[PDB]
Structure formats: C-alpha cells, structure tokens
Amino acid sequence: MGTPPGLQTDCEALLSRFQETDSVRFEDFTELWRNMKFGTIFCGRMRNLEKNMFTKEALALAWRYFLPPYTFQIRVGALYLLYGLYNTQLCQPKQKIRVALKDWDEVLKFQQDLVNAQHFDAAYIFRKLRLDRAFHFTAMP
Amino acid sequence: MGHFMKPYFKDKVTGVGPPANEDTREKAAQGIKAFEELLVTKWKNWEKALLRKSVVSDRLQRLLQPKLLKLEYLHQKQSKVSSELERQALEKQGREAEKEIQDINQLPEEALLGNRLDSHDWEKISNINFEGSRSAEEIRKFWQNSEHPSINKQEWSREEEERLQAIAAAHGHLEWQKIAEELGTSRSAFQCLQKFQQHNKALKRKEWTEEEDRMLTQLVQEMRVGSHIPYRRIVYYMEGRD
Amino acid sequence: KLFQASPSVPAKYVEDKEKMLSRTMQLVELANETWLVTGRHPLPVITAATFLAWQSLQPADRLSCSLARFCKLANVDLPYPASSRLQELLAVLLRMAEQLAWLRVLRLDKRSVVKHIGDLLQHRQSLVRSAFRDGTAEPALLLPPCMLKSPKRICPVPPVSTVTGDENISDSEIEQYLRTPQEVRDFQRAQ
Amino acid sequence: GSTTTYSSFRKNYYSKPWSNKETDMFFLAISMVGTDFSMIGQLFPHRARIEIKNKFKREEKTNGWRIDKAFQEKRPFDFDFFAHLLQKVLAEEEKRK
Amino acid sequence: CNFPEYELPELNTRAFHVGAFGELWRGRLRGAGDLSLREPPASALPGSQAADSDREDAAVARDLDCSLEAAAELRAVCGLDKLKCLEDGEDPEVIPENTDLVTLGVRKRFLEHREETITIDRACRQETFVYEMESHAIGKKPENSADMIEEGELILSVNILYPVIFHKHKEHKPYQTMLVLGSQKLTQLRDSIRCVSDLQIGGEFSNTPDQAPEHISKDLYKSAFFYFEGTFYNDKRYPECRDLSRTIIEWSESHDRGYGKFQTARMEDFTFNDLCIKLGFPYLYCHQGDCEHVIVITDIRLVHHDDCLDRTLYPLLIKKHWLWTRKCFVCKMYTARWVTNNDSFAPEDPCFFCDVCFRMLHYDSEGNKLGEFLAYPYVDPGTFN
Ligand SMILES: [Zn+2]
Ligand SMILES: [Zn+2]
C-alpha cells in the first residue's frame, strides 16, 4: 500500500527533532525515542498479518531517510530509527528491511563512512542490524 | 499498464486478436465452452420497458405493413388503369385500407401484444431494436416466460404455498410442469420449483449427515491453510448449502 | 476499398457494392427533388449518401463510425460540406419518419433514424406526399433551403422612385472634405 | 495522392478579427486623418489597405452616422502620437484582460 | 548494465538479466555470510551479553577498526534497553496509553469506534490469505535433502492474473501470486498451476445427463507457454501439446499490428536465471489454447534463513484473490453444476442449474427428458478458484 497511516509524521518529527540536537550519538536518539515511547507502535490490536505488513512498510519507509540525498546526521538518525523499528517489532519471524541492489554497495560504503567519522555508535548499530540480518536483498525497496 | 488486460495482444488499427487456433477449434467442435460464456448481466428496468416497446412495435408493424403494402399496390394499380368502374373499385379497396389503418392505429397496447405464444420477429428485434446486445432466443425466453403480461407475476399466497408443498409429493417432487399445472394458478415449473426449494427442508439444511461430514473434512484437510478455508466454495460438493 | 477484406478493413466494414450503389440511387433521387442538388457542388451529395448507406447496411456494426474515420479507411478525403449535407438529410428523413405511426412510435432521432432507412426507402414516394405542405397540383415546406429560413417580410413592392437632381449644393459639405493647411503640414510631417 | 481530392474556394482564408478598441482607433482616425486607406494602412501596420476598405464596407452598412460624427470631430494629426496611442491602449486592454 | 532502476516510479523497473543480477548480489554477499541459511546470534538487553561478548567483541573490533574495549562500550551502549519501551511480555491487542505517537492516536480512532455490540468481533483485518501463506511455511525446512533451497538462491515472486478480469475495475487486479526459484525451469511453474481452465468440459447431454464426458481439457490438450522479452516458451513434452507460437507469429507479423518481432523457444529450454526481464511489466502465459494469464514479476531476491526452505511446498503460493461462486438460478443459494439453453422451463437463456435442481426440473422418475431444452455439464471457476 505504501506509507502507513500517521507513521510518516511520527518518523519525520523524530528525525527532525533528533537532527535539531546537532548530535549523532545513539544516546540522544534513545532518550528522544523513550520520551515519546516510539517502541509502543507495534501494539494496538494488530493481528499477525497487519503486524507483519506494517513492520515491512515501516522499515521500507525509514529506508528512504537512511538513503541519500540526506546528510550524515539525518542518515544516522534514520539508521537508529530502522534499528528501533526492527528490534521493537513483535513479528515472528522478524520482518526485514528491503534493500535494493542499487543501495547495498552504497550502504556498505556508508558503513565505512560511519567508521571513518569515528562516530562508531551508528557503525555498530549497522553491523548489529547485519548480525540480526535485518536488511533484505530485494531488487526494490 | 492496464492496457495489457485480456487479450494481451490487440491490434492497433482494428482491435482484433489472432485467429482461432487448432486447440480452440477442436474444443469448439467438442462443444467445450469458454469461461466468457458465463458472463450474464442483469435485466434493468429500462431494458424491460424497451423490450415491451420493441414487442409492441413489432406487432404494430406486422399488422400495418401488409396493410400498407395492399394500399400502395392498390394505388399503383389505380394510377395506371383507365376503366372508371375498375378505378372506383380499386379506390374502394384503397378506402378499405384507409379505414383499417385508422382502426388499427386506434388499437390499445395489450391488444397489440396479443397472446403469449404469438409469432414475433426475435431475430430482427435482437439485432436491430436491441442491436444484438441481447440475443434473439434470450429475448424470446425472457418475454414469453416472464415478461409477457399473461404470466402470473403475483406473490405466493398461503394456500398456494401449502398446496404446492402438498402436491409436490404426489409427483415425487419431480415433473414440476405437472405440479405447476395441478396448482392451477398458471405458475411455471421453474417458479414452482424455485418457491419449493427456497423452503424445502430436504435442500436447505440445519442438519448434518455422514457423507457431508466426510467430504467436508477431506476438503478442509486438503485446502485449508492455517485459519483460512473456502467456506462458501465447498458448497459445490456437499449439497443443500450456501 | 470496401469490396474486399484487407488489414485496414475486416469483414464488418466489408460490404456488397451492388446494394450500396442501389441505396445511393434511392437517396440521390430524393436529393434532387428536394431541391438539395441544385446550385451546390455535386460531390458532397455523393459522399454523404455513401457514408450513410454504408452505415445503414450494418447499423449495429457501423453506427459507431464517423465521417473521417470512415473515409480514411477508404483513403478518401472528404468534403467539409458533407457535414452540411448530412445535417440536411437527417433533418429530411426524420420528417419522413414521423409520417408512419409504426415509425412514429419509436420516437426517432439523430441516433436512431439511421437503422430504418431500409424501411423508409420502400415507401418514400408516399412519405414525401404525406409530408409536404405544398399539396397543390403544380405540413412541411417542400422548398429549397434558401427560403426555408423564411423571409423577414415577403418582398413588399420596392420603392422605385426619382428625386430632384438639379438643386443647389451646400458648399459647407464640400469644405468639410478639404484639409486645412495645418492638416496639410501634419500629413507632410507624417509622410 | 488520390483522385478524390477536393477543390473548393480557399480565397476566404482566416483573417484576424477586429477589436472594439481597434474600431475606436479607426473612428478617431477618421476624425484625425481622413479616408486615405493607404495612409491608414500605414498607421495600422497590422492592417493592410484592403483590410481598411473591407472595414469601411462593413461599417457603412449601419454606422454611417458614427462615420459622419467622427469625421466632423476633427483633431490635429500626428503619426507618432497615433502609434503610441495604439500600442498603449492595446497593452492596457491586455492588462485589463 | 544489469543494474536495477525504475522506469515508472514504484510501478515497473528497467530490464536486467536474472543470472547476472543474482551474481551481482552474491559478489557483495558471498563469503560475508549474510546470505547464509544458518542461524546467527541476535541482540539482547545489555544485562545478558556476557556469553556472547567473547564471540562478538573481537569481530566488532575487527570490522569497526576499534579496540576490544571500544567494542564492549558500543555493545553495552547500543543495548535494547535503550529502545524497548515495551517490556518483554506486553500484549499487542491493546494500545499502550504511555505513548505520544500520532500513529497510535489514529489507531485509537480506529479501534474505539468498533467497541459496540454491533461491531465487536475479531474478524478479518483487510485480507485473509497472506498471513496464512506465511505462517504455514515460514521458517520450515524439508524432510528430503533434495528439496532444500541452495544458499544464496534467487527467489522470484510472480503474479498470475486470472483470465476472469473484473472488467469493472482496473486498479486492483485478480491474481494469485507464486514464488519460483532461479535455478528452476518454466516446466515446474506450468505444472504447479492449478487453474480451472485445465478442468474445462462440455458437450450437450440433455437427453442423457449421466453420459457427461470422461475427459477434462487437461486430458485432451496439454498446450501451454510463457512469453518473455519477445520469446515464446512452448511445451512439447506430450503429443497433446502444440507449438502455438508459430500460429501467433504467422498472423501477428503479417502487418504493422503494433508489436515487434518475436522468437520461439521451448518451455523446458530456460531456467528462471536465463531470462532478461523487467519487474512490474505485464508479460504473458497461456494454456489450453485460450486461457491467457497476465504475468507480472512483483519481487526478486536472495533466500534467507528465515524464509520457507522446504521445497516440497515450492512453487510456494503466497497470495490469492477471492472470486464468487456461480449459484444456481433456481434456489439462488447453491452453486450450479449444469447450464441450459433453449430451455422451455427456464425463464432465461442461458440458465444455470445445480445438479439436483437440473435433474428434478428436466426429468421424470426414470430420467426421461421432459420438455424442450439443451443441457451441458458445468465446472465452476468461481468455486474451483
Ligand atoms: Zn488458466
Ligand atoms: Zn438448487
């Protein structure tokens, strides 16, 4: 279906308010995540199909902000958003982030960029999403 | 992207597809029907009004056109004959036609309709008045069995219902034309069978039987996935369901 | 090119030539006696008649077509007056259509009248004499369109007259037609 | 390329209609210049002399009284002011529209 | 290049070769193990990472080019306690009031108006079939080693549109979605299709209704073919198969009918890896000479350990569309097994009859024909869907 109901505003508000902190640390993002309690989104009487397809579309939506042309800090915030969405989901199995072949090499280069920036929270969280194998190797997101 | 809907090939100048193949021709020879034959559309009210209009026009034309042919042939003969008495006799026949056109035009619609089984031009009606949108025999069935005013269109009375249910057994719930005729209310066999089966306890079920349970279990085990089954498509195999 | 099948015309457009030419005769004969032929370019009459005859032979198949859509299949370039002739002839044939009650009952119009010309052509000589208001030996006016629009007044006697041409002439009118030297200089500057 | 080719009278090609304000300038020209259709064709570069004659032929059918009234309401003649009045009034007409 | 990209945004893609596309994935994944079908470790709260630290800290230090203590710091820092606003055990059936989400407010507006005796129920969400397809197959592994997906295999998703087009709606589509493997051939997809057109039967049997034909169309004809990138792929494994591609070409290329030049291959010639194809672009499959199916490739991807790995279930059905049954005209509640024409009893022609209704109306106690009519057996595509 595309962008889920009311999710776009919550995601962009979180990302913009994180960007306005002028900070990249996962800690700031987590304080913000926990004040507004974003992890609660996966409750609210979603039966299994709705839950899975909502997780899929939420991850695909956050992917667009993790991708360019967004800058370093906003992409880092979107990576934390992907992280929160994937690890607070209630699906079984854990539904995946759809990553395009046109995106995979650029995103690995972004891992190297996160490493080079000495800004290692985002790099660890990306490697950890890889360990969870959250990213999925689909032709299109 | 929706332009590729069936047929996936459609010619750009005339819209036609490829010609008939060997397999389709052999299937038609064997009489195997195509799924496009299953498409049937509902009779909307203006369709029925147009049908009545077409039937009355057909009857009016069948009446008048021979009369006007007589009139015009008489006039043509009159325009060339020189004998005065023969001229006046031909004029008298022309006056016959002139009177008759006025009288028949003064006929009312029901008299034009006449009897349920009278001759009507289904072909011309279908391809000209209905432009072929509905076929000749489809129109024929619809009119002669449901739409002509002589058909009993009334609601079923309690006495009619009870006598239907009683006399249905006398024929074994078979041969429903005989049941309809014995009912005496000018019902059709289809009407009587429809009314019977919408209430017959033998068809619509609150009950269960061993073969229905067996095949329900078999189809459920065959086709269910998790929580889903095709509830109302299992009906085709176990009888009396909905 | 209507007489054989071709990739441009499948069979539903194909037709027998004999029927068409006959039908066109039965129409053109009406055109002349209804004053439509006289004083016009003749060819538009033929085009209109052929277009409608071809339609009416299979109206269920052919009612959906149009002037140019029909002609470009035959690679024919059409008259623009053919539209005028078409409107004229439909106007005529509906007036024939009302003459017969068993045609009157259908409440015929532009869309529907086409598929009955086969019916009308059998009795057209009766239709015209039942339709014209000019029942004289020598309800609808059987006249050319040039006065079917009707005169605003029926040509009263013209005012044939003379005047006195010998009077004196007002010199003021003459001097009004002359430029002053100031205007002469203005035109010289403009030139 | 076909033998069906139509031939009909093409000498009535689409000419540009006349504006109401353009007509007003035409009348003030009769007031201001006269009936020298060649000269008027020069004051209206967008109209040629035959257009002026056709304009006069159309106007004379009903508006002879206005023709005379303009002709008697004489004004001193200037080509330059005339051209400025034209394009300014045309631009004003477009801006209003 | 075989580099995916949109031709129309979110509607269709530019063409690429499937095998090279798979190798372009594996050139970025082979050896890394992210494409493997083997269970990796996962996250947890920072309080129970001690056992996994010995295995994780060294690898994190290697990949992030940091020290072991930096890896441990990042691991405890990025723990899930910083994100789990929901405790491990809270049910999803209720909206947590401790939230500021606009999404959960909109969800509140969705749920609260249903809390009335007229609307209280646990019925379908929007559609039924998809999660049933997932739950019965997801995460499973085969009982036979020969039915086990190869690691890094391409997984394709194909929509097979029904021949019965809605013809009142063109936005949403009638189809069933099918997963196929890159290494597999077109033969297997064609064999797996359960379409009702194979079950087509006919013949006029008003005089002897019990002499219904012994052969379905599948037993009489076996022709079928896919069509991609201008190439037909026709089956010729059986004598009942005919290469329909020849006749199609012989008429289509006779005129500028608006389509390009085509070529002919067999069905068994190609694996799904051999194709050069677009995603979302309408393609064609046909069988029984007349049942054309619109083919849309809606997804293609590598396999992963969470996927259905049991190939006995492959080709895997994942979505379907719910056609309605053709209920008889007599009782209007029951699906027809017969259809009649020229019927003197029926009010219309054609008229559809269930087996029982057909038999009582048209026959006496001994099955003798009554009245004037023609009859044909009927298999319902709205039932056998
Ligand atoms: Zn099929
Ligand atoms: Zn029934």
Swiss-Prot record, chain A:
Domain of life: Eukaryota
Signal peptide extent: none
Location of region: SNAPC3-binding: 1-141
Protein localization: Nucleus
Oligomeric and partner information: Part of the SNAPc complex composed of 5 subunits: SNAPC1, SNAPC2, SNAPC3, SNAPC4 and SNAPC5. SNAPC1 interacts with SNAPC3, SNAPC4 and TBP.
Summary of the function given for this chain in its UniProt record: Part of the SNAPc complex required for the transcription of both RNA polymerase II and III small-nuclear RNA genes. Binds to the proximal sequence element (PSE), a non-TATA-box basal promoter element common to these 2 types of genes. Recruits TBP and BRF2 to the U6 snRNA TATA box.
Name the record gives this protein: snRNA-activating protein complex subunit 1
Annotated organism of origin: Homo sapiens (Human)
Whole sequence portion shown: 1 to 141 of 368
Swiss-Prot record, chain B:
Name by which UniProt lists this protein: snRNA-activating protein complex subunit 4
Residues of the full protein shown: 142 to 383 of 1469
Domain named Myb-like: residues: 109-147, 203-242
Subcellular location, record wording: Nucleus
Gene from which this protein is expressed: SNAPC4
Disease linked to the protein: Neurodevelopmental disorder with motor regression, progressive spastic paraplegia, and oromotor dysfunction: An autosomal recessive disorder characterized by delayed motor development and developmental regression after the first year of life, followed by progressive spasticity with gait alterations, paraparesis, and oromotor dysfunction. Most individuals have cerebral, cerebellar, or basal ganglia volume loss.
Segments forming domain HTH myb-type: 148-202
Summary of subunit composition and partner proteins: Part of the SNAPc complex composed of 5 subunits: SNAPC1, SNAPC2, SNAPC3, SNAPC4 and SNAPC5. SNAPC4 interacts with SNAPC1, SNAPC2, SNAPC5, BRF2 and TBP.
Function comment: Part of the SNAPc complex required for the transcription of both RNA polymerase II and III small-nuclear RNA genes. Binds to the proximal sequence element (PSE), a non-TATA-box basal promoter element common to these 2 types of genes. Recruits TBP and BRF2 to the U6 snRNA TATA box.
Highest taxon above the source species: Eukaryota
DNA-binding region: 176-200
From Swiss-Prot, chain C:
Region (Required for the formation of a ternary complex with DNA and TBP): 142-148
Post-translational modification: In response to oxidative stress, Cys-146 is reversibly oxidized to cysteine sulfenic acid. Oxidation of Cys-146 impairs formation of a ternary complex with TBP and DNA and down-regulates expression of target genes in response to oxidative stress.
Effect of C146A: Abolishes response to oxidative stress. Abolishes the decrease in the formation of a ternary complex with DNA and TBP in response to oxidative stress
Region entry Required for interaction with TBP and formation of a ternary complex with DNA and TBP, spans: 150-191
Induction: Down-regulated by epigallocatechin gallate (EGCG) treatment.
Cysteine sulfenic acid (-SOH) carried by residues: C146
Record localization: Nucleus
Family: Belongs to the TFIIB family.
Subunit structure, as described in the record: Component of TFIIIB complexes. The TFIIIB complex has two activities, alpha and beta. The TFIIIB-alpha activity complex is composed of TBP, BDP1, and a complex containing both BRF2 and at least four stably associated proteins; this complex inhibits the transcription by pol III via its phosphorylation by CK2; YY1 facilitates the TFIIIB-alpha complex formation. Interacts with TBP; this interaction promotes recruitment of BRF2 to TATA box-containing promoters.
UniProt-recorded name of the protein: Transcription factor IIIB 50 kDa subunit
Species of provenance: Homo sapiens
Higher taxonomy: Eukaryota, Metazoa, Chordata, Craniata, Vertebrata
From Swiss-Prot, chain E:
Region span, Disordered: 37-56
The keyword Methyltransferase appears for this protein: no
InterPro entries, per database record: snRNA-activating_su3
Major location category of this protein: nucleus
Domain of life of the source: Eukaryota
Classification via Pfam families: SNAPC3 (PF12251)
Assigned GO CC terms: nuclear body; nucleolus; nucleoplasm; nucleus; snRNA-activating protein complex
Keyword line: DNA-binding, Nucleus, Transcription, Transcription regulation
Annotated coiled-coil segments of the chain: none
Transmembrane regions: none
UniProt-listed GO biological process terms: snRNA transcription; snRNA transcription by RNA polymerase II; snRNA transcription by RNA polymerase III; transcription by RNA polymerase II; transcription by RNA polymerase III
Localisation: Nucleus
Gene Ontology MF, one: RNA polymerase III type 3 promoter sequence-specific DNA binding
Function of the protein: Part of the SNAPc complex required for the transcription of both RNA polymerase II and III small-nuclear RNA genes. Binds to the proximal sequence element (PSE), a non-TATA-box basal promoter element common to these 2 types of genes. Recruits TBP and BRF2 to the U6 snRNA TATA box.
Subunit structure: Part of the SNAPc complex composed of 5 subunits: SNAPC1, SNAPC2, SNAPC3, SNAPC4 and SNAPC5. SNAPC3 interacts with SNAPC1.
Similarity comment: family membership: Belongs to the SNAPC3/SRD2 family.
Protein name: snRNA-activating protein complex subunit 3
